[PDB]
Ligand binder design. Structure first.
Ligand code: HEM
Ligand SMILES: O[C@](Cc1ccccc1Cl)(Cn1cncn1)C1(Cl)CC1
Length: 529
């Protein structure tokens, strides 16, 4: 009968629970291994799902290959499966949609369909603090971006340019990496100098002289502490009780405390001007429902703004230096533009004159094409998503992944994509531009279409608002580098490959260049010890 088989189910169960633990832990790995494999083969039979990349190790998925070489990973998947495909990543299912259609499917997705803050809050909230960026409803984000943008105006950039210039010259004068008054040539690691120059120039201009002054003290170590807490590791283990995580948390409290100290001091003195982003957020951080940002939230939002601009910009100036190091022809061409626009150095650099340096701006544009700082952008899917002109459905709980930086490197959209060529942007020197209709999500009119193959600043509701600041900063910095120095590689060295494991696609260090003064006898004035 069949009842006697049912007895043997029970018997077999009892014999299973009595196996030697050698065989039993052997089975606790062999069962999920086999089940994973069986599940994938079953999955490939669904026609309402994008092809899923095969993987051996459950939960881990394609994490290794994706983690180390994501563009190579995407190209292989693209050849095998086309532009839409899925892969497992440390517990999650990522659906990749490559190319301009993918830009459109993700950046222009319905607010109800996808969530950025659901993807990122665990990465950023620990670092920035509560109440801001991804620790708040999207509508709050939209207004925060409006608040920050309102400090990032043309009139602010006119005032930031000499402050940024002052910092670059102070760095050339005082830093051990240069000391131009004492040395006429030297070797630097751009992954040491550019992060420093970046935080010095961004602090001075966006936070002001007090906050810049504090980076000359041991307080600077908190920034370094806070900086470590910004790592992909936060995606799997956002909070685990080790030391790294406590120095981070301490840094957040300590730095936000310093900003709040200055904010409350400015208000108690009625010392509220138009100097910096701090003045600006103090005068302009009331939401449309009338709720005012707290001083804590203002401080946290300052941290997020500085942190965002820090890693994107520092990686970008590093790459610019690295590409130009093997292109003395491009340095020469940029130097001639500087001499023409600044009347042989006699004109002081201003924001308006920066806008008349198309080749310098094209050099930034081309670096951002070859080295998009963020190789992958994510959203969590909130509701089932039908993929147009397919029968594909992306179910809620999945994640979508868009990669404009991958398209940046495709010969079909950029001929000879792997060649650094600033002249591919001749008569097209703008950081970005909308080829047509606009829309406003709450922080200004931006392009409605997100189909450009070039999208260094993303698009849609989550689009960057830092692009003009980053061009101002990079522009001032590279204008001074060009006028002051020539540089090249040590023998046999060339452009390093990207390190894709970090949060930005920074160069693999150490990435060293050799500088020499164009004018060995030129002195940088000012007092120093
Ligand atoms: C070369 C420099 C930069 C590049 C290439 C860059 C790139 C991007 C990209 C691709 C996004 C969209 C992210 C997504 O869709 O998930 C973004 C968003 C954003 N960025 Fe930047 N960024 C840069 C610098 C900056 C700077 C300097 C600031 C501030 C001064 C900044 C602040 C922001 C903010 C507030 C968002 C909005 C995020 C959201 O709404 O979800 N970024 N950036
Ligand atoms: O978009 C960011 C997050 C981010 C967004 C706004 C402000 C700061 C940060 Cl760090 C990075 N970023 C974007 N612009 C500046 N930083 C990443 Cl790390 C990709 C998810």
């Amino acid at each position: 009968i069949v009842g006697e088989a049912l007895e043997y189910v029970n018997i077999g169960l009892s014999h299973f629970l009595a196996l030697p633990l050698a065989q039993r832990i052997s089975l606790i790995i062999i069962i999920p291994f086999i089940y994973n494999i069986v599940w994938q083969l079953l999955y490939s039979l669904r026609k309402d799902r994008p092809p899923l990349v095969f993987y051996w190790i459950p939960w881990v998925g394609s994490a290794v290959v994706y983690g180390m070489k994501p563009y190579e990973f995407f190209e292989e998947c693209q050849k095998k499966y086309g532009d839409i495909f899925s892969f497992v990543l440390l517990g999650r299912v990522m659906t990749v949609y490559l190319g301009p259609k993918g830009h459109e499917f993700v950046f222009n997705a319905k607010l109800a369909d996808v969530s950025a803050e659901a993807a990122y809050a665990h990465l950023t909230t620990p670092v920035f603090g509560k109440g801001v960026i991804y620790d708040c409803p999207n509508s709050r984000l939209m207004e925060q971006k409006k608040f920050v943008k309102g400090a990032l105006t043309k009139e602010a950039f006119k005032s930031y340019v000499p402050l940024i210039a002052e910092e670059v010259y102070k760095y050339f004068r005082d830093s051990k990496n240069f000391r131009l008054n004492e040395r006429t040539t030297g070797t630097i690691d751009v992954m040491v100098t550019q992060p420093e120059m970046t935080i010095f120039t961004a602090s001075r201009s966006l936070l002001g002289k007090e906050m810049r002054a504090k980076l000359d003290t041991d307080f600077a170590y908190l920034y370094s502490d806070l900086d470590k807490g910004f790592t992909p590791i936060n995606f799997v283990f956002p909070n685990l009780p080790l030391e790294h995580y406590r120095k981070r948390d301490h840094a957040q409290k300590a730095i936000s405390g310093t900003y709040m100290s200055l904010i409350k001091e400015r208000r108690k003195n009625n010392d509220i001007q138009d100097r910096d982003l701090i003045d600006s957020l103090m005068k302009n951080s009331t939401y449309k429902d009338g709720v005012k940002m707290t001083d804590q939230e203002i401080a946290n939002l300052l941290i997020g703004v500085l942190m965002g601009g820090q890693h994107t910009s520092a990686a970008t100036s590093a790459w610019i230096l690295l590409h130009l190091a093997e292109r003395p022809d491009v340095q020469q061409e940029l130097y001639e533009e500087q001499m023409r626009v600044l009347d042989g150095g006699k004109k002081e650099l201003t924001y308006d004159l920066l806008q008349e340096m198309p080749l310098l701006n094209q050099t930034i544009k081309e670096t951002l094409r070859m080295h998009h700082p963020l190789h992958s952008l994510f959203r969590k899917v909130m509701k089932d998503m039908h993929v147009p002109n397919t029968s594909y459905v992306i179910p809620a709980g999945y994640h979508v992944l868009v990669s404009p930086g991958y398209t940046h490197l495709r010969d079909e959209y950029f001929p000879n994509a792997h060649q650094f060529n600033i002249h591919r942007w001749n008569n097209d020197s703008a950081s970005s531009y909308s080829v047509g209709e606009e829309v406003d999500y709450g922080f200004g009119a931006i392009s409605k279409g997100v189909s450009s193959p070039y999208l260094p600043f993303g698009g849609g509701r989550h689009r960057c608002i830092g692009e003009h600041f980053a061009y101002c900063q990079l522009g001032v910095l590279m204008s001074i580098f060009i006028r002051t120095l020539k540089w090249h590689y040590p023998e046999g060295k060339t452009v390093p490959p990207p390190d894709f494991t970090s949060m930005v696609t920074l160069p693999t260090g150490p990435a060293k260049i050799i500088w020499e003064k164009r004018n060995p006898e030129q002195k940088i004035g000012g007092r120093h010890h």
